[PDB]
Design an enzyme around this catalytic site. Sequence first.
Site, PDB file in Angstrom:
ATOM      1  CG  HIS A  99      45.144  41.890  37.424  1.00  0.00           C
ATOM      2  ND1 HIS A  99      44.043  42.703  37.252  1.00  0.00           N
ATOM      3  CD2 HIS A  99      45.802  41.887  36.240  1.00  0.00           C
ATOM      4  CE1 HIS A  99      44.040  43.179  36.019  1.00  0.00           C
ATOM      5  NE2 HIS A  99      45.090  42.691  35.382  1.00  0.00           N
ATOM      6  CG  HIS A 103      45.136  39.591  29.517  1.00  0.00           C
ATOM      7  ND1 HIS A 103      44.681  40.891  29.535  1.00  0.00           N
ATOM      8  CD2 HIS A 103      44.145  38.851  28.967  1.00  0.00           C
ATOM      9  CE1 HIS A 103      43.461  40.934  29.027  1.00  0.00           C
ATOM     10  NE2 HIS A 103      43.112  39.711  28.675  1.00  0.00           N
ATOM     11  CG  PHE A 104      41.825  39.643  35.399  1.00  0.00           C
ATOM     12  CD1 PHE A 104      40.520  39.952  35.038  1.00  0.00           C
ATOM     13  CD2 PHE A 104      42.042  38.832  36.516  1.00  0.00           C
ATOM     14  CE1 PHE A 104      39.442  39.477  35.779  1.00  0.00           C
ATOM     15  CE2 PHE A 104      40.973  38.346  37.261  1.00  0.00           C
ATOM     16  CZ  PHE A 104      39.670  38.665  36.887  1.00  0.00           C
TER      17      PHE A 104
END
EC number: 4.6.1.18
Length: 124
Positions: free
Chosen positions: A12, A119-120
């Site tokens: 990310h 976590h996205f």
Amino acid sequence: KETAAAKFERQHMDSSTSAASSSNYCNQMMKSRNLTKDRCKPVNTFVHESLADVQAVCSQKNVACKNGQTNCYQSYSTMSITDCRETGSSKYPNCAYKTTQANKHIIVACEGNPYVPVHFDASV
């Protein structure tokens, strides 16, 4: 093999550019961040801000994650991001992605000590 924090960074984080550089940005990044090796990862967002600014989101607005978990945080400000999504002609192992640049709040789940993104969840 990968820590959750390092996996988030690999998937990310792109602090090297202020925004996606071309329509081929996602094809290049999904490959080089190893997100097309096992399969074509269907959807993935890259964040064009410093690692420090993204880590800082873990001290910002506490909100629910899509799955109901309580450890999600939404950035107070909008951030430069690129959404990468498999598109028409994509079939493993020749993955093909649409690149969509935008400026949105990010929502990440955080864990650990130090408390960092793992976590996205979404962008708004």
